[PDB]
């Protein structure tokens, strides 16, 4: 496995409320030729949280896909999830830092890959629940991965939704805000928000919090706005078939939101029509 005594702390890669992600070297020969790894652990470790976490490792372990971050293992004395380390970091940071080299055709490459990732998730009846650029990783200039599964649930065998009561409320589907119900359709809502993020280049002045707050007890006010068909605006320069996808994803009716398989096709065609 991984002996935690050969696991060297290099640098803090992020902190997410109830969990941390660290860059570490696993170095059993103590000459720093050991492999650099990403290491996830809990921070205010709770009995319920540990169980959630042991459920999360199983999920990721079960997942094998070019656009899902690779499981490497676990380490125990203090339960730590071990994953491959991807230097380019989260898509959110990466976009802001290299956007001058990221054009619309490139954004649409990342988008398709996210959809394929999500296609594969639904193939296992997995609801991600935390779709946002902060959770997508950048492999190389031509590839992204879904890189965290902290809120991921498995749909009961009978149901098309999973119920669970801080939350990323400016990414949440209406029914998710009022009923705590999540689904592939709620994941499709959030994907639409991810698409928005992508097409605003993560500009602080254009963020879902920024825009909704300008439109706006905060969660209540927000429920009213979405009920009333208040929606994030079309990003500057955003193609009409792209804002179209976003608005379809943001359908109030759960049964009217597109499919990931359809989203992947349409995105791929938009991007191929743009190019040549
Ligand atoms: C983007 C990704 C998910 C979120 N995470 C994080 O901060 N959180 C998830 C749990 C709470 C906080 C950061 C993590 N980053 C930057 C990584 N960077 C490089 N290689 C990596 N391998 C595995 C993750 C990872």
Swiss-Prot record:
The record's active-site residues are: 130 (proton acceptor)
The entry's localization annotation reads: Endomembrane system; Cytoplasm; Nucleus
Q: Which domain of life is it from?
A: Eukaryota
Where, in this chain's numbering, is ATP bound? 13-21, 40
Q: Give a brief account of the tissues where this protein occurs.
A: Ubiquitously expressed throughout most tissues.
> Could you tell me which residue ranges the Protein kinase domain spans?
7-268
Q: How is it modified after translation?
A: Autophosphorylated, leading to regulate its activity. Autophosphorylation on Tyr-26, Tyr-120 and Tyr-126 in response to growth hormone (GH) are required for maximal kinase activity. Also phosphorylated by TEC. Phosphorylated on tyrosine residues in response to interferon gamma signaling. Phosphorylated on tyrosine residues in response to a signaling cascade that is activated by increased cellular retinol. Undergoes Notch-induced ubiquitination and subsequent proteasomal degradation which is mediated by ASB1 or ASB2, the substrate-recognition components of probable ECS E3 ubiquitin-protein ligase complexes.
Spell out which residues are annotated as carrying Phosphotyrosine.
Answer: 26, 120, 126, 161-162
Give the protein family.
Belongs to the protein kinase superfamily. Tyr protein kinase family. JAK subfamily.
The condition associated with this protein in its record is:
Chromosomal aberrations involving JAK2 are found in both chronic and acute forms of eosinophilic, lymphoblastic and myeloid leukemia. Translocation t(8;9)(p22;p24) with PCM1 links the protein kinase domain of JAK2 to the major portion of PCM1. Translocation t(9;12)(p24;p13) with ETV6.
Domain description from the entry?
Answer: Possesses 2 protein kinase domains. The second one probably contains the catalytic domain, while the presence of slight differences suggest a different role for protein kinase 1.
Briefly state the protein's biological role: Non-receptor tyrosine kinase involved in various processes such as cell growth, development, differentiation or histone modifications. Mediates essential signaling events in both innate and adaptive immunity. In the cytoplasm, plays a pivotal role in signal transduction via its association with type I receptors such as growth hormone (GHR), prolactin (PRLR), leptin (LEPR), erythropoietin (EPOR), thrombopoietin receptor (MPL/TPOR); or type II receptors including IFN-alpha, IFN-beta, IFN-gamma and multiple interleukins.
Q: How does it assemble?
A: Interacts with EPOR, LYN, SIRPA, SH2B1 and TEC. Interacts with IL23R. Interacts with SKB1. Interacts with STAM2. Interacts with IFNGR2 (via intracellular domain). Interacts with LEPR (Isoform B). Interacts with HSP90AB1; promotes functional activation in a heat shock-dependent manner. Interacts with STRA6. Interacts with RHEX; this interaction occurs in a erythropoietin (EPO)-dependent manner. Interacts with ASB2; the interaction targets JAK2 for Notch-induced proteasomal degradation. Interacts with MPL/TPOR.
Q: What is this protein called?
A: Tyrosine-protein kinase JAK2
Q: Which organism is it from?
A: Homo sapiens (Human)
Of the parent protein, the shown chain spans: 843 to 1132 of 1132
